[PDB]
């Protein structure tokens, strides 16, 4: 009857990055495929302030979720010990439109991402253990560690600190808008991304676009396309990988019904 | 003044109810209405089709104005059909956040939420239209809106004595009544109960007369009304039938909860569209009534009329008290 409030230990009681990593894996290509997502609707509150409402449902019965996300940026919040990036994650049934669980945003929000990345490191990293980077001591890094272990039991960039193509030993995982590569870290090799919006939202990409280094011809496919095999992942010995992820409302409804499917047995 | 939380706080419907009373809720409108309504920003809803079916409507507003420093989204899904399957139409969630450093603070049913918002609402409007002698009440309509009008008119008017409850199968009115006189309810003990199921016998009856309908056969016609009546047509969402006739707003006066009821109730719409009221005449809203800019009942032989929507003031009001209150236990 009523709905369900997750707190976040309860959201780190239930999930497990192997698990959610699992779960991505096997619902992306059907969960992109009946998913709608609408453009977002953003407002600021305040000239220091915005709200974001990001609305997706299924209203085949194969997937049946409303999945609604209000998230809150305060970045003046910062200045102060409070963070700026806040909200909710609100569930609804898609039959009967009932109120299922809400959740908080931003935890799901590290879950998410950081098993989007692990998943990613599935195709593209290669097969080593006990060599892993990580840059910043953020929010994200357990969660990353525990997503790469998980995949490969690579660097990943979640706080931001710019890393040079030149550093790099002959896989680079990028979370989404500051520097955090250089020009030509994409240089190396083939580049990888969650899904077609990371074309236009990742600094870094359009940015490399802007001076000509690359062409959208030569990115080597989005991560739907590499669970699905259809473009290929790592390929050499040696070779260059990296993924840059800024997020899409598909994951996030896959990771929310998660939470609530494995929440209710 | 006592505890604050970091996380936000689900407030259930079972907590909704013991958390709020009727008569400080009304109070509470009463005395912050002007206050939101300068200070909160409502842009237009968002709607979606999700389905042949089904819809999702989202409605924020938000005030960066500290003296009320709040941010609401309520979430509202619309399943008709689900009536097929004796299952609610209307669900949904109210999510409050605070808008000085922008956390969520609360979560709560926006179904109830909205019995609570739209009978307080009604009977805030009795205490500026309904005639202070007001001894009968009657009630067309035996739905989940009836009993918190009841309570809402009864704590505007202490005066009431009787209430007459009709619908058109009489046997859910005299359930009601029954249940209403055996409630134990302390703002229920004062009050006689009874079922009936002609509207037009008893019509004539009520000091206060208060609609909560959507059918033909609830029409509550003007030439029935009493003198020195008071009309309440209680507007809710996806409900669209005309709950008086031409001549009820013609023999009054007509107020509306605010502004968007003159485009939004299809009462007023007709009326405006076939002459026999004309909009500049209307005499005004919730708010200009509660800061004095326009007066209420002028005599005791005045038919007053009072036409409620919705809005998000309101919505942001309750939502506003339910939390603040459960922060003050």
Same mark, same amino acid.
């Given at each position: ?9 309860? $959201? ?16 992306? !290509?059907?969960?992109? *495929? ?12 305040? !000239? ?12 085949? !019965?194969?997937?049946?979720? #409303?999945?609604?996300?209000?998230? *809150?940026?305060? !970045? ?30 931003? @935890? ?109 011809? @030569?990115?080597?496919?989005? $991560? ?15 070779? #260059? ?20 499917? *494995?929440?209710?047995?």
């Amino acid at each position: 009857s009523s709905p369900i409030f997750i707190s976040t230990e309860n $959201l780190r009681t239930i999930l497990t990055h192997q698990t959610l990593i699992n779960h991505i894996q096997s619902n992306l !290509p059907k969960a992109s *495929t009946f998913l709608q997502t609408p453009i977002r609707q953003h407002y600021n509150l305040s !000239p220091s302030s915005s709200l974001l409402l990001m609305p997706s449902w299924s209203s085949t !019965p194969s997937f049946p979720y #409303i999945g609604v996300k209000l998230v *809150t940026h305060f !970045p003046e919040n910062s200045s102060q010990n409070l963070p700026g990036v806040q909200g909710s994650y609100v569930l609804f049934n898609s039959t009967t439109g009932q109120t299922l669980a809400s959740m908080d945003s931003t @935890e799901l929000t590290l879950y998410r991402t950081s098993c989007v990345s692990g998943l990613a490191s599935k195709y593209l990293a290669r097969d080593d253990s006990e060599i892993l980077v990580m840059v910043g001591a953020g929010a994200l890094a357990p969660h990353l560690i525990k997503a790469h272990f998980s995949a490969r039991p690579i660097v990943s960039c979640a706080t931001n600190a710019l890393v040079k193509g030149e550093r790099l030993k002959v896989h680079l995982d990028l979370v989404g808008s500051m520097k955090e590569c250089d020009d030509e870290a994409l240089k190396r090799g083939k580049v990888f991304v969650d899904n077609e919006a990371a074309l236009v939202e990742a600094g870094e990409l359009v940015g490399a676009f802007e001076r000509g280094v690359i062409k959208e011809d @030569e990115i080597g496919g989005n $991560l739907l396309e590499l669970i699905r095999g259809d473009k290929v992942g790592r390929s050499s010995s040696e070779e #260059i990988t990296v993924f840059k992820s800024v997020g899409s409302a598909v994951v996030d409804m896959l990771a929310a019904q998660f939470v609530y499917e *494995t929440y209710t047995r």
